[PDB]
From a paper:
For functional analysis of the ANK domain, we determined the crystal structure of the ANK domain at 2.1 Å resolution. The ANK domain of CLPB contains 4 AMs and a unique insertion (consisting of 2 short helices) between AM2 and AM3. The RMSD between these 2 structures is 2.6 Å. Our data showed that the ANK domain is indispensable for the disaggregase activity of CLPB, and a deletion of the unique insertion in the ANK domain resulted in more than 50% reduction on the disaggregase activity. Next, we analyzed the dimer interface of the ANK domain by docking the ANK models into the density maps of the double-heptamer and double-hexamer. For the ANK dimer in the double-hexamer, 2 regions of the ANK domain contribute to the dimerization, the AM1/2 motifs and the insertion.
The human AAA+ ATPase CLPB (SKD3) is a protein disaggregase in the mitochondrial intermembrane space (IMS) and functions to promote the solubilization of various mitochondrial proteins. Unlike canonical AAA+ proteins, CLPB contains a unique ankyrin repeat domain (ANK) at its N-terminus. The N-terminus of CLPB has a mitochondrial targeting signal (MTS), followed by an ankyrin repeat (ANK) domain, and ends with a C-terminal NBD. The ANK domain is not only responsible for maintaining the higher-order assembly but also essential for the disaggregase activity.
Numbering used by the authors: 132 to 297
Amino acid sequence: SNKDAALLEAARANNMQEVSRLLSEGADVNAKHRLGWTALMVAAINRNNSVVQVLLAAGADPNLGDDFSSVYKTAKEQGIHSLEVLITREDDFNNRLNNRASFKGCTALHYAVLADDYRTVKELLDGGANPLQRNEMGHTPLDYAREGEVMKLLRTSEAKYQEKQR
């Protein structure tokens, strides 16, 4: 309800104390914004490592995909005005992303890689996030990475996936 919306706002704010309280009051740990993203997603894109750990410890699914596509596609798909979609995505999710691109199926790991924050990536991988999972465009978290530790962290986890699969 409003408690699910309060969860997402606290996730954006990195307010771990508030996230834990709302979770204790029955907020859905996998609640989705009307435009299609989760609390773990909005925490990941904003480098909110503190809240990511709280969400993972409370059972958040790290492999869900954003139902948000682009301002253009989501405006038509859902029948909202494009300016409202753009403002909402910039204000309630992130304003440094190119939201003209397509994000459908992006997981929290996708967003954590786009933010170039090794700590959030490492925590998401320890929470069971699939580094081989593709978005609607077919891109994995690797495909969004850049030369650095984030790639290396991904490469070893991807290597361990082949090793530890069943």
